[PDB]
Amino acid sequence: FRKISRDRGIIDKIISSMAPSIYGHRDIKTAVACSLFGGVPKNVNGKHSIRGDINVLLLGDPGTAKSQILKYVEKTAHRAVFATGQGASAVGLTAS
Amino acid sequence: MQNQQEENGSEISIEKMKRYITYCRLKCAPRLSPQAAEKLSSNFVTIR
Ligand SMILES: Nc1ncnc2c1ncn2[C@@H]1O[C@H](COP(=O)(O)OP(=O)(O)OP(O)(O)=S)[C@@H](O)[C@H]1O
Numbered sequence: 001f002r003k004i005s006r007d008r009g010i011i012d013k014i015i016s017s018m019a020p021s022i023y024g025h026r027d028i029k030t031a032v033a034c035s036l037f038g039g040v041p042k043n044v045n046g047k048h049s050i051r052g053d054i055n056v057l058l059l060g061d062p063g064t065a066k067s068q069i070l071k072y073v074e075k076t077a078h079r080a081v082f083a084t085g086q087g088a089s090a091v092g093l094t095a096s
Numbered sequence: 097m098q099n100q101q102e103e104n105g106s107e108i109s110i111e112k113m114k115r116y117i118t119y120c121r122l123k124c125a126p127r128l129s130p131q132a133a134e135k136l137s138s139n140f141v142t143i144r
């Protein structure tokens with residue numbers, strides 16, 4: 001990991017590593033890489049909290065392969081939970 | 097900077113602030129003085 005990090009163009013390779021079956025959506029893949037790696041949360045003096053993870057909204061027409069990007073992130077990420085609004089046989093978004 | 101200002105005393109920590117709010121609400125309940133009523137009545141008449 002340290003050997004592959006010292007490459008100058010490492011980040012772009014990660015951008016090229018996001019969803020190989022998906023072609024041409026480089027900025028979407030960049031957003032995926034940023035969300036997968038994420039920032040750092042912080043809490044200054046305990047009083048004020050700053051969130052430390054990137055929320056990405058993929059708004060697109062049908063046939064832009066957003067669902068395949070979601071499936072790729074579900075495969076790649078450590079604790080990835082898939083849910084949907086219209087569907088039924090899935091974990092809900094509401095506590096109960 | 098906030099830790100320094102807490103050490104000087106210009107800012108109060110959140111738990112001390114919590115317990116102080118609890119203490120002030122449990123102990124004190126002020127009344128308006130008679131000389132503090134004419135100013136308030138006059139200012140409320142002028143606004144309306
Ligand atoms: N840029 C792309 N590269 C590769 N395959 C693509 C691309 N765009 C669309 N597809 C394919 O087209 C189909 C679209 O499937 P979906 O991922 O369900 O599309 P979608 O973006 O989710 O749109 P919906 O279903 O209306 S929300 C899949 O078979 C994809 O593999």
Ligand SMILES: [Mg+2]
Pocket residue numbers: 066067
């Ligand atoms: Mg879809």
